[PDB]
Design a protein around this ligand. Structure first.
Ligand SMILES: NC(=O)C[C@H](N)C(=O)O
Ligand SMILES: NC(=O)C[C@H](N)C(=O)O
Ligand SMILES: NC(=O)C[C@H](N)C(=O)O
Ligand SMILES: NC(=O)C[C@H](N)C(=O)O
Ligand SMILES: [Cl-]
Ligand SMILES: [Cl-]
Ligand SMILES: [Cl-]
Ligand SMILES: [Cl-]
Ligand SMILES: [Cl-]
Ligand SMILES: [Cl-]
Ligand SMILES: [Cl-]
Ligand SMILES: [Cl-]
Ligand SMILES: [Cl-]
Ligand SMILES: [Cl-]
Lengths: 326, 323, 336, 334
């Protein structure tokens, strides 16, 4: 039998109506017979302490997860991370950067309704992720939800109230479950062979600016003066912003102070393609990356001992399948 | 039949290679389908200057609303040609500024210029004209890729696609195929009486995205600001960070209107009731486009902070779904 | 909108276990499996009673006598329960839902057909969730129509078709939106109501009736129509192209006109997954209509087959059947 | 993924104008009308466009009146012009466009130039027509994205022709490819999907001609009997397509199975498809009765594949095998 490790980090899946209650998720799984059917892999559940609402997660929580995977890596055939839905895509994106040369599947899942509440998706998303980790292994950080497996660094929580909570707007899913499980012909991510390398991260102050009609030079000035190390712009369309000379001079001053300024689309899908004023102002195009990928990629790259110039070039390069190259 | 007014404000649809005055109208004169018997009569007004929609300011919404007001009595319907990058903001703003609207106002444009090969500009404009004449809905709407959406429900979702706009929390109002079908989407609250056009004045508003590792400093900075939109996780959650929550209550105690929306493409905010205790108002399933233009509208009127806070959670123009 | 019913009293739902994939094994097996699944016994759930059919049937072996058996079992238990779930094989579930819609007049309680693509006994079963949702919907959202619940959506039965053979989203309603969608919350869609009678349930008989189903395709001959004009045939369904077009061939049109002359009901449908028949649009006259073919609007083949079974089994003459076939009787078609 | 061809030389595309809604006027064909409307539309004459030559068929046909002889006529027209043009666009009525595209896929072997079938739901230059954009796109794809397959272009997607079906009678998105992603999608940019390649031969184009073949199309529905089947045996029939439930299920009662086994004993090729819009046949029982599974083929691909194979001097065993084999990209192997 394959053996799967399950990191139970918290989230809706394990909660009760009144809140997280320690031991409750595992008491439920003990009284559902589907989990110890002979077709199932063996699995072990590690309950984290404390159990966290994913909306309370900080980048240091990504580290604690990556180090948990690293400790268990040699002893199991694959890894399932149970997680709250609110920041699931940010965790899946972070783990894709931090886990280099990954040689076993890592699948992040959870539920929109608690295992404890009626009509829960928990039992079905967990059973599917175990079965998929054992039988259809893909050596990438993935997110499994509502009968699809997505590349983790391509995912976004798209549908706050739906069982189809997550989308992968710029990439098809990797696998789809029906009567059969079907691997799709989605191109593989760049994929290192060799020993697993797990990259620690350190806190990094990053701002996220949304472009909208009437935005002022003040917000950029704002982030210049509380030293941020990086600024993500959610720009219109394929990466457009108002022509405003004061706005542009603040972006230019940020880059002159060594702040990494990255331009993403605010649209749910599409690719940035930016005379060329933002570029003139030292802004880097983020291609079709999500904000989740872009933020976690910055945490990854700022934590390594890299020059601003090296970081600015690495931000537009496909490191782990997060973006579609030219 | 009918007579349709066309406001050509700028945008991709009219560009070459750069907007160029007279290029859109020179192109339409060489395409027979427009002047054809089953079409309505229409007139194009070219704005001066023509604008990339990414350069629009809230004052540009006022110029468009006032243009519609001047033309309202003399035409059966109104088509607004606009760049795609901020089309949903303009459609949202016009829905609040135009009260008791009694004729269709449809915003459209193209993802490829009329002058480029494979342009969608001809078909989106012809469809808008035909629908404003023959299938009038008395609301501000956005027509794109064979669907008509409620304008204050729209968002530019697909930067590279012909299907560039979505209405994530509301089905379209109409769909075009061999026939044009009205869908059974519930009507918006709709005043009858004389058109009223609400002018707006500049208002400083900030837009904060919640993400892992956000600090209290962002909120502390915005504390030159009359309102703050939070793009929260899921159904409206944010980290429990006491410093963060203390800056939000300090914002609300200084009379700043703080509105919680979802960062998800679709869903409804339903908010330890910590944000609400910190004076944050839930914005239900409103888009950022609708919330931002609704705050410009309400802050421009003679209303105190408490009336604006109450109005932000009410369905004024079909922008949100009650209870 | 579908009604939001009171939750104040504990409901009792009758489950007609007809057979299907849900109860199968690699019997009494379904009922023991539900006893062992604690979700089915929570305070928030309705009480339910399973009637296991003898024998249990693969839905591929269903006939119209089976639709009648199920209608009789609903009528037998109607006054005793608050609603009905029909557990059924996926292959012909849309035919059954469509038939029940026409047979059950003055229906004042929900009837929901469901099942699963994978057996409850197998890993990755959808049966637990489709059945649990059906029971919870029958108790709490008690729409007085025959409906079909699959993969978090409730559909009007007589608008459904099995569209995806391998998918958990097996069913669609190609010409009407779903009545209800389930997520964190159960949402009711603006779907306008079907025609509704009043008083005690009346079950209209549905008998076996010889009906031929002709697919129009390039190279089809006059001999196919001539072939069905032999033996008993009472009605023909033409699966035509697009908005209802067929070859303009004189032998073909003459064989069709011969059929309507002899009292055969000939109904024109689209072969397409969605859209609406509108005859005569792409040549000068209206050739099929002049041959006495009746337009079936946007009906599915499932709805059309069961509607003909229903109307031929009633006390109606040929002219009245022809007229009724293009009339919206139960929400199966969208009027002009 | 579809090739991105050179733009350096001006291409020449041949347009087979068979008929169809695209060229009609108010509900009738008129000779010369489509060609004059195109002369009058500047976008078709821009420098970035290929050169094109229209052959107007006589008479122009409603595609609902097409027979298999019409597939033969189109294949021969392609073969007659093949060396002279860089690509081929077939303008056609929507109703049977998917059957034509399927038929051409089997009939054309060693195809080294694109062949794209397109048309419109509304007649050209008629209000709200999709004909200008479906034809402009087909010509630009044929010139620039020269996939060596028979394809179908509609509503900003290029589909593999022998995977397509008219799914939406009233919609501008009329066609679907339910069991394969599209080859190409058009937006601001033309995107190629990495849809893997069909089998490709090499050398000069070879046309595999067809000759009439009586084929029956049986829908499985509740109450169908061994007699309904025995009736399909009471004409000249050489092959029977069953549109079975779900993953290829039919009544398992002994009469029905004996009737199907008698059909196969008489040398009839009986092929089992799903009646579903998507999915794959997976059947003892029917197999024991001589029935061949058609995997995830459409009815359009199965019917045209049988016209191709039955018109060849092949024994029944060889045609049965060939029916379950992926010859042109029409089906997904196990
Ligand atoms: N997750 C995403 O990045 C979606 C979208 N680009 C946004 O800016 O929120
Ligand atoms: N237009 C929208 O508001 C989409 C999404 N709620 C966002 O925060 O960007
Ligand atoms: N179920 C349906 O009726 C779909 C399609 N009209 C068919 O002819 O099978
Ligand atoms: N075109 C198709 O084959 C769709 C569906 N399998 C049918 O039987 O019609
Ligand atoms: Cl949602
Ligand atoms: Cl790697
Ligand atoms: Cl896009
Ligand atoms: Cl003004
Ligand atoms: Cl109850
Ligand atoms: Cl499927
Ligand atoms: Cl349709
Ligand atoms: Cl001339
Ligand atoms: Cl060219
Ligand atoms: Cl050769």
């Amino acid at each position: 039998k394959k053996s799967i490790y399950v990191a139970y980090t918290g989230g809706t899946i394990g909660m009760q109506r009144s809140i997280p209650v320690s031991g409750h998720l595992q008491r439920q799984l003990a009284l559902m017979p589907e989990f110890h059917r002979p077709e199932m892999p063996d699995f072990t559940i590690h309950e984290y302490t404390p159990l966290m609402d994913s909306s309370d997660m900080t980048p240091e929580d990504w580290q604690h997860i990556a180090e948990d995977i690293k400790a268990h890596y040699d002893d199991y055939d694959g890894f399932v991370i149970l997680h709250g839905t609110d920041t699931m895509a940010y965790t899946a994106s972070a783990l894709s950067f931090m886990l280099e040369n990954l040689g076993k599947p890592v699948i992040v899942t959870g539920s929109q309704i608690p295992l404890a509440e009626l009509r829960s998706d928990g039992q079905i998303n967990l059973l599917n992720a175990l079965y998929v980790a054992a039988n259809y292994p893909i050596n990438e950080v993935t997110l499994f939800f509502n009968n699809r497996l997505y590349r983790g660094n391509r995912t976004a929580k798209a549908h706050a109230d739906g069982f189809d909570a997550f989308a992968s707007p710029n990439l098809p899913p990797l696998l789809e479950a029906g009567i059969h499980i079907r691997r799709l012909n989605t191109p593989p991510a760049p994929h290192g062979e060799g020993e697993l390398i797990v990259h620690p991260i350190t806190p990094q102050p990053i701002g996220v600016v949304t472009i909208y009609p009437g935005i002022s030079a003040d917000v950029v000035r704002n982030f210049l003066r509380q030293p941020v190390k990086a600024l993500i712009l959610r720009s219109y369309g394929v990466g457009n912003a108002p022509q405003n000379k004061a706005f542009l001079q603040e972006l230019q001053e940020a880059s002159d102070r060594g702040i990494v300024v990255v331009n993403l689309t605010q649209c749910m899908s599409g690719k940035v393609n930016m005379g060329n004023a933002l570029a003139h102002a030292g802004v880097i195009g983020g291609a079709d990356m999500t904000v989740e990928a872009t933020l976690t990629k910055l945490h990854y790259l700022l934590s390594q001992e890299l020059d601003t110039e090296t970081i600015r070039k690495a931000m537009s390069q496909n490191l782990r399948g997060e973006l579609t190259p030219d």
